[PDB]
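User: Need the bound-state model for nickel (II) ion:
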Amino acid sequence: TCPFYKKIPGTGFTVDAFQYGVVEGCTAYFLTHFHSDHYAGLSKHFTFPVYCSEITGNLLKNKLHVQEQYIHPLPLDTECIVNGVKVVLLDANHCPGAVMILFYLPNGTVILHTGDFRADPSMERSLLADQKVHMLYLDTTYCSPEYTFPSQQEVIRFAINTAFEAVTLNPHALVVCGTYSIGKEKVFLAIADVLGSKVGMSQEKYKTLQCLNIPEINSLITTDMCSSLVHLLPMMQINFKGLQSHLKKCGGKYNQILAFRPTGWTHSNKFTRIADVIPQTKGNISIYGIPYSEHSSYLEMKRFVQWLKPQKIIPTVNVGTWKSRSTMEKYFREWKLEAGY
Ligand code: NI
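Assistant: Bound-state model below.
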């Protein structure tokens, strides 16, 4: 059955709760963003109201084939009424169309659900600053002090300079960027822009990108692989074997590959700065691991929560084991004692 952390008290609302069949009591199903763990169970066969951003709605319609009558897109940063309750959707700084939701309960309680997010100081001057938040449903993906990473901008700058140098040294090199879902689009779009190229990709991936309300998208992406010097491939193909194979497929138009695997955290975050990063190399193919994160680091999460000062925290990630929950509760108490709430 639907866990308590996906229910919003004093409403018949749920969030990211599509895998449990019909939820008893539920009159409106919110979807924070289009990642398969969160949407799991939604399909053309779902017949209840789904509330979401416009971008998430485009994806639901076109990729999952959910019928249009059941999709209720809402604009950002706007007070809206859903089934008699005031809500606001905010940018989560995660992947395209990802939202946090603010719920104003009839009794006067205020609840923030972060969905998946990457906490940032610009969220300190949104509609959140205007009133007290009593309860916080928190993306606790990286809630442990070992999880540090550079800013998105440091990582993009590194990627840009690396790619520009390699292709100026060898104008017959191909750049490849690995991908599995939506998110991290800036990696491949910034590389292409410094090289004066469009990004080439499969038909399914192109269809996905065409839903995302990215300005000038038609000038940036194509399905003609031939005509482009940055290609997207599935993450699973980003290895020496898959990359040599792809290079045979392109018809001797390129004689070298430089490939980027955007990952989350891995253990080498604990020593190496972004400037020290060096690739793995086998012959005429080089692979760079770059920690481009769309989740809060420990320090970013801590700052956001210390600012917000919620009366209660409800974790939404890593809640499946008692050890993880116990560990997280310890960090929440520390933050509360340091900050005086
Ligand atoms: Ni996500």
